[PDB]
TrEMBL record, chains A, B:
It comes from Antirrhinum majus (Garden snapdragon). Its cofactor is Mg(2+). GO terms for molecular function: dimethylallyltranstransferase activity; metal ion binding. This is Geranyl diphosphate synthase small subunit. The keyword Magnesium applies. It is an enzyme of class 2 (transferase). Keywords: Magnesium, Metal-binding, Transferase. Its EC number is 2.5.1.1. The keyword Zinc does not apply.
Length: 256, 256
């Protein structure tokens, strides 16, 4: 592996180890079995690593952002689970997955995973009395990503979908789902990192741009090459205000 | 109406109006339409009123509990929405309701409502009081009600309940759903009104007993009347060592 890959993977290993301490497979039974299973079977999102990297970029330790990064992963897991949830007329996502558990169980496990991430984030503060306004602000960010400003807005418009036709509607969905998830990750990193009000906004915009790109790639319909270079350039702009070699690894992680 | 009824109705009206400020009908536009519809169509839970009442009881102002009380209502509506949600096998709840919106929409709207309440709660921080510690502690309580310690655990076990069933299993379901909901409301009430560790747990237990009664009552299928009287006196016991006018009103609301 390259320095960049090693860096992403180590972050992702630290996140997974952090979650494993919080969610025992302790089951068959209690929500814990489907909660443990869905969390670690789900595809990862680069939004979780951006959270940690954003925090380090501004001088935080990674233990400062571990709870946030894990919460980001969990919001994503909750969204992913509910998107692939078989309803009356099947799931919202047309690309089918394997299900080890019944629909009813996936529904409630998704419901339990949403606040669990916010509970971990809420319960991280306090050991020596750390950042109550900060952790509260981080919580605001995560609540924003899951709801009407973020993922659920995206999923709402994802319903009226068409075959690679409405490109602006597709982009909008990517911005609201993968976009908002990265924005939140980056903004949490920065908040927990102890950051300028101005520098939070910038990393937030950064996350939005790379998250939208990550979304668009996940469509892979190519009608987007020009928009992708457009957004990548905006991502770089935001980065210019920071520095210190973590910049290079972050640029690396996001193919910039 | 009696003083007790008026007192409860005023609270419920103050909660509704506080929520009406936060969720626009927005007409068709966005998840806000179903979010608004489902919030104000859903049956109320007394856990919401207990929050305000618990707060006032310990010298709190009601505007201090208003966000919490609304968040409690919202947790209850997300739960209600999801358990009546038509799946492949139909809804988890055997008691059918009317559905103005499609299953897929109800699934998104439920997911948006969960963090929204926590966001309302989080955005209520009072830097001129000491709230970041307090409000953060309130968020812990609400995250608890929704998850593995609460409603989801209850719903998980409720799966596979019929006639002539496990009575201890039924009470357990009531404890985890209605019980935890009231326990959280009461405990948030206490936290936000500003009392100590000892008195918070007393109100949380109070909430648990009365919530468990509300759940058992909301079934009335056979022989619970014995256990219901046992739980009511447990609730009164908790109320000893609290004082004031509000004690009679709370005893009234919950018929102790």
């Amino acid at each position: 592996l390259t320095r960049t890959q090693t860096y992403r993977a180590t972050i992702e290993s630290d996140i997974e180890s952090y979650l494993k301490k919080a969610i025992p497979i302790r089951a068959p039974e209690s929500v814990f079995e489907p909660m443990h299973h869905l969390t670690f079977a789900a595809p990862r999102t680069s939004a979780s690593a951006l959270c940690v990297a954003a925090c380090e970029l501004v001088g935080g330790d990674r233990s400062d952002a571990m709870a946030a990064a894990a919460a980001v992963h969990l919001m994503h897991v909750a969204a992913y689970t509910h998107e692939n949830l078989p309803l009356t007329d099947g799931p919202m996502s047309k690309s089918e997955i394997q299900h080890k558990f019944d629909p009813n169980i996936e529904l409630l496990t998704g419901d339990g995973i949403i606040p669990f991430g916010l509970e971990l984030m809420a319960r991280s503060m306090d050991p020596t009395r750390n950042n109550p306004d900060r952790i509260l602000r981080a919580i605001i960010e995560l609540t924003r990503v899951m709801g009407s400003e973020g993922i659920v807005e995206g999923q709402y418009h994802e319903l009226g979908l068409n075959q690679l036709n409405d490109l602006e509607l597709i982009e909008y969905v990517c911005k609201k789902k993968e976009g908002t998830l990265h924005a939140c990750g980056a903004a949490c990193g920065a908040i927990l990192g102890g950051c300028d009000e101005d520098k939070i906004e910038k990393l937030r915009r950064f996350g939005l741009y790379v998250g939208t790109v990550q979304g668009l790639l996940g469509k892979n319909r190519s009608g987007f090459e020009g928009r992708i270079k457009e957004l990548k350039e905006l991502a770089v702009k935001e980065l210019e205000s920071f520095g210190g070699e973590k910049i290079e690894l972050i640029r690396g992680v996001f193919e910039l």
